């Protein structure tokens, strides 16, 4: 019985490879992607496979180096790139991985010598071989040999064709140290490229996640919010179990630090509460301002944030709570009594409240224009927002951009291949 | 990497040699450090006192790999002094020298179409490395490649001496002019 | 003989682009 599932599942690979070879000389990026997807969901599905991969065309380990040794190009690259899938999915985690990487190095040696149909199929499957490199790495430990090779290959990426997985791998190296490596992103700033094709469309969101992370490290919320939200927008797949929970944790903690108070009606996904409820507790504490409860929840949930690379952020928010609260008070009224606001925010005394308001004048909540007299706190929000002159630019340039984004049109009429 | 910038801030020729050692040892493993120290390295660029003054251009060329500016690599090679020829082949040195060679060919055609003379000669090291690579081709005995460089170089001297690539005159040596007829237009 | 291949590829490229601009102009004219 076991053979039958294998006997049905491990044969369509031959048809896919035949199609790949046939289109190789046709040339790629229009048929390869489907084969890559098939490879992926075969890998999730994963014996006699090493014997069946024996030299499909002529004109475990010994099975690995038997084919080429026997009667012997993109198809060869794909075969050399997918002999480690069995152990990969099985994740033997033994030295067999140390038996696998040489195949990767050999594949790396093979692909480097190739070159651009290779740059359109082998180049991208290079992405998944790098994924395996990192996996094989983290299994034992991080290493920059991959980093060195990637940096070298950046110039080639600068050649005719470019994949952007390399930026993702560099971010992987950064995060390996995590809170320790901060110069890496400093480099990534200048080294940043366009890669606007976004052909994978998953690497873009992936890198956006860690870009938001690094930006948040320096508390640059004004743009961190938007980048993190945009990243979350590009995640159609399920990616539920422990995959997007981290992204949500980062986004919500950043938002709470900025001053906005979210409510779980937003996400409340079934498969998040069990892991994200500590943030619910802390946000509930913050909205009120119960410092005692805040430290209670902090010391209770010492881990998670410590294990999620966000402990420092909450530790610093533990004093930004005051600004978080004052945002609402500044928003509501239009002429505040300094003493009254001091009482509301349980501040020390009038001079303390005045100083806090001044400190909060900076940028953000509408200007206070404190008069330092009976007027106390003015907080005179700008008016005339009525699509009139005052929102001349405000309600014109918005539409100007919203319409200049119509380049989707020109893209659409530049897309039609209309073969023959 | 902070040692790199910290050491460079120090002023001593031995300090410069130590910077040389570390930077040529690590070119891309630490890139933003040199990326920001571009100022110090380029001010050292022009200094007769610096024993390794040409090594400043060497640094420019080597560690501007991220800096895709082609002209940057061109001037880096021009100031390289000695190491440009030595770097026959490596990970990316071969790429930059090949780019320099193509740019030199472009300049040669550009200033050769100028027929009245007074053509601004290019930095000597550039044609030196061009001829060195021509010699490598002669060793490889790639007559077609050599003549192609000669014509794109717009220099009839290399075109003439390319006949020594194999010195048999079966075909191309005496019959590639037909190929030239087919694929050229400049009367 | 990669040199000849590159040369003919360049010739094809220039011919293709001139054809393209001509077609653009012709369509523009035909609109009127």
């Amino acid at each position: 019985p076991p053979p039958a599932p294998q006997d049905v599942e491990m044969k369509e690979e031959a048809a896919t490879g035949g199609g790949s070879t046939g289109e190789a000389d046709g040339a790629a990026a229009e048929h390869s992607q489907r084969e890559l997807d098939t490879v992926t969901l075969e890998d999730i599905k994963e014996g006699k496979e090493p014997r069946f991969v024996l030299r499909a065309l002529r004109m475990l380990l010994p099975f690995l180096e038997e084919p080429m040794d026997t009667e012997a190009r993109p198809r060869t690259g794909k075969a050399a790139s997918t002999p480690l899938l069995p152990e990969v999915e099985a994740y033997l985690q033994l030295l067999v991985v140390i038996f696998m990487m040489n195949s990767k190095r050999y594949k790396e040696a093979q692909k480097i010598s190739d070159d651009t149909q290779n740059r359109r199929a082998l180049d991208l499957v290079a992405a998944k071989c790098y994924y395996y490199h990192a996996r094989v790495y983290e299994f034992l430990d991080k290493l920059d040999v991959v980093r060195s090779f990637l940096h070298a290959r950046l110039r080639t990426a600068t050649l005719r064709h470019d994949a952007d997985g390399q930026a993702t791998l560099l971010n992987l190296l950064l995060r390996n140290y995590l809170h320790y490596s901060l110069y890496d992103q400093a480099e990534k700033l200048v080294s940043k490229s366009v890669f606007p094709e976004q052909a994978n469309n998953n690497e873009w969101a992936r890198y956006l996640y860690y870009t938001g992370r690094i930006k948040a490290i320096q508390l640059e919320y004004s743009e961190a919010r938007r980048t993190m939200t945009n990243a979350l927008r590009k995640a159609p797949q399920h990616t539920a179990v422990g995959f997007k929970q981290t992204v949500h944790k980062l986004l919500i903690v950043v938002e709470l630090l900025l001053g906005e108070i979210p409510d779980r009606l937003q996400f409340r996904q079934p498969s998040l509460k069990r892991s994200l409820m500590p943030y619910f507790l802390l946000t509930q504490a913050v909205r009120t301002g119960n410092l005692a409860k805040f430290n209670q929840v902090l010391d209770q949930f010492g881990e998670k944030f410590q294990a999620d690379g966000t402990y420092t952020l909450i530790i610093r928010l533990r004093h930004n709570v005051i600004k978080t609260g004052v945002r609402m008070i500044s928003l509501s009224y239009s002429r505040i009594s300094l003493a009254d606001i001091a009482q509301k925010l349980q501040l020390d005394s009038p001079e303390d409240a005045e100083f806090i308001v001044a400190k909060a004048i900076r940028d953000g909540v509408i200007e206070a224009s404190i008069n330092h007299e009976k007027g106390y706190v003015q907080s005179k929000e700008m008016i005339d927002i009525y699509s009139t002159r005052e929102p001349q630019l405000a309600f014109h340039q918005r539409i100007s951009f919203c319409l200049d984004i119509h380049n989707m049109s020109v893209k659409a009429m530049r897309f039609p291949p209309k073969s023959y | 990497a902070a040692g790199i910038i910290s050491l460079l801030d120090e002023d001593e020729p031995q300090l410069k040699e130590f910077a040389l050692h570390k930077l040529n040892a690590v070119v891309n493993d630490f890139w933003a450090e040199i990326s920001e120290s571009v100022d110090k390295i380029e001010v050292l660029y022009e200094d007769e006192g610096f024993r390794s003054r040409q090594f400043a251009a060497l640094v420019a060329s080597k560690v501007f790999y991220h800096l895709g500016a082609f002209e940057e690599s061109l001037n880096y090679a021009l100031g390289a002094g000695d190491l440009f020829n030595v770097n026959d082949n490596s990970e990316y040195v071969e790429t930059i020298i090949a780019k320099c060679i193509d740019h030199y060919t472009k300049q040669c055609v550009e200033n050769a179409d100028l027929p009245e003379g007074e053509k601004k000669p290019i930095d000597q090291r550039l044609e030196g490395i061009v001829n060195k690579m021509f010699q490598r081709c002669l060793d490889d005995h790639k007559y077609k490649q050599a003549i192609g460089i000669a014509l794109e170089t717009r220099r009839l001297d290399v075109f003439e001496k390319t006949i020594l690539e194999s010195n048999d005159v079966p075909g191309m040596l005496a019959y590639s002019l037909k190929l030239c007829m087919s694929l050229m237009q400049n009367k | 003989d990669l040199y000849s291949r590159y040369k003919k590829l360049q010739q094809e490229l220039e011919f293709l682009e001139v054809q393209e601009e001509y077609i653009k102009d012709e369509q523009k004219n035909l609109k009127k």
Partner: peptide, 30 residues
């Protein structure tokens, strides 16, 4: 065997997408 003379060919072949552009505009003209 300088690679200078074996990269421009790949460059032009990649650029040939102008062929597909010509096809589409020819379709419009037709």
């Amino acid at each position: 065997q300088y690679y200078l003379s074996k990269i421009e060919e790949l460059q032009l072949i990649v650029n040939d997408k102008s062929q597909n552009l010509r096809r589409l505009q020819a379709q419009r003209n037709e």
